[PDB]
């Protein structure tokens, strides 16, 4: 029923063709319940020039949505298209491109409408403008498409960093708990709150790189879990350095001990300073 | 109610054997349901000492609903029947008097 949610956060509709503002989406992925819209504004057909006027100054980097800020053409179809690229690790990236016609955008331009017409059988966008110029112009090959993949992932990731560090460039090790708790959704288990309230010492912080890497690590969650099959069935709880080289070869993204020690310090309720499979992975499969 | 029980018992075994599954997988329940009864009857006879014939089994059940119906309604029953005894007992005696009075024949006893 994602469509019904898409109606909630969206406030721009055209004969039922609800267009999403760039902010609504970013709010649909950051916040969970927001209702202040009270608007059917876009009916005046300013849309056809509204977006194209403002997209001409878009930041191709990690600000492609932090540059427009609630003005842009985002269709419900494209909305879901971001949801699927939300969860793609590096592995699926080439495949997600290869899932499309893979013969260059000459065969992938129509795939956009094909993306649209797919939802129809089931029953001028900002991206298409950035992907195909004005009327199907730009030849957005894989790497160019891949560029748009990672930064937009980083973007939603990055903006999340501020929402917990309250804008400051540093996130208290205590703040980093809620994000994990908001991730694992096992927050009602006070034992972890009991764990963090004493085991964690309110001290230094975590920068964006250490957090953005960790968030990216979870994008590759599965490949890590498989590399942990031999140990999970062995039930031997993992040590820090073991866990580092593990996630190293698992995701390809190194982490900082300043994170995982806390991750250990919060997830090692057994008190052995070693993460068994049911300790970390067990709660991670709550959602 | 027993007729209803006996009615659906003929439907939920009719549709379930012509439109639905089959005969050859209902028969091994068809049989097990009759033999299912035959225990209940026997179980009834062990539960209470009657061979479970309807015109009797009704009256026993009726008799429960009466006592449970009367004892709930607080209406006395012991003193009622004792009254009803005293009537017939006294009545039947008056019947014995028909011989020596209306007929002058010796009284039977």
């Amino acid at each position: 029923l994602r469509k019904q949610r898409f109606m909630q956060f969206s406030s721009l509709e055209h004969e039922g063709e609800y267009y999403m503002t760039p902010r609504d989406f970013l709010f649909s992925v950051m916040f969970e319940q927001m209702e202040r819209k009270t608007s059917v504004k876009k009916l005046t057909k300013k849309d056809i020039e509204d977006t194209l006027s403002g997209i001409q100054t878009a930041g191709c980097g990690s600000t492609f949505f932090r540059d427009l800020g609630d003005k842009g053409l985002i269709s419900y179809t494209e909305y879901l298209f971001l949801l699927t690229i939300l969860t793609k690790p590096h592995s699926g990236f080439h495949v997600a491109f290869k899932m499309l016609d893979t013969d260059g955008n000459e065969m992938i331009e129509k795939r956009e409408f094909f993306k649209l017409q797919k939802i129809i059988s089931k029953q001028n966008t900002t991206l298409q403008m950035r992907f195909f110029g004005k009327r199907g112009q730009r030849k957005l090959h894989y790497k160019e498409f891949r560029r748009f993949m990672e930064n937009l992932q980083t973007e939603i990731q990055e903006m999340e960093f501020l929402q917990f560090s309250k804008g400051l460039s540093f996130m208290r090790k205590e703040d980093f708990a809620e994000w994990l708790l908001f991730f694992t959704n096992t927050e009602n288990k006070d034992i972890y709150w009991k764990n963090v309230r004493e085991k964690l010492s309110a001290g230094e912080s975590i920068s964006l790189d250490e957090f953005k890497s960790f968030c990216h690590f979870t994008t590759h969650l599965e490949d890590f879990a498989i590399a942990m099959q031999m140990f999970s069935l062995a039930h031997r709880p993992v040590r820090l350095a073991e866990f580092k080289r593990a996630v190293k070869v698992a995701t390809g993204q190194e982490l900082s001990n300043n994170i995982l020690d806390t991750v250990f310090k919060i997830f090692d309720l057994d008190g052995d300073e070693c993460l068994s499979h049911e300790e970390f992975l067990g709660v991670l499969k709550n959602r | 109610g027993g007729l209803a029980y006996m009615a659906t018992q003929f439907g939920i075994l009719a549709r379930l054997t012509w439109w639905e599954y089959s005969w050859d997988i209902m028969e091994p329940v068809t049989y097990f349901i009759t033999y299912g009864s035959a225990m209940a009857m026997y179980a009834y006879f062990v539960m209470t000492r009657q061979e479970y014939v309807y015109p009797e089994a009704r009256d026993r059940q009726y008799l429960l609903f009466f006592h449970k119906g009367a004892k709930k309604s607080r209406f006395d029953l012991e003193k009622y029947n004792q009254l009803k005894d005293a009537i017939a007992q006294a009545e039947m005696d008056l019947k014995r008097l028909r011989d020596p009075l209306q007929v002058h024949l010796p009284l039977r006893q």
């Binding site: - | 539960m47 209470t48 009256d59 026993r60 009726y62 008799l63 429960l64 009622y80 017939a88």
Partner: protein, 50 residues
């Protein structure tokens, strides 16, 4: 019979105590032994037919 000859109402007929649950204490623990002495029989009989 609802009432005796005098018209008096017959006594509340006796229902065996816990009967409906007294009977399950024998039929149920015997339905099972009714089954298990089939397993130990079919396997005891398979070696010469089916």
């Amino acid at each position: 019979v609802i009432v005796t000859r005098s018209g008096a109402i017959l006594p509340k007929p006796v229902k065996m105590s816990f009967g409906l649950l007294r009977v399950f204490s024998i039929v149920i623990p015997f339905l099972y032994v009714g089954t298990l002495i089939s397993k130990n029989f079919a396997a005891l009989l398979e070696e010469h037919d089916i």
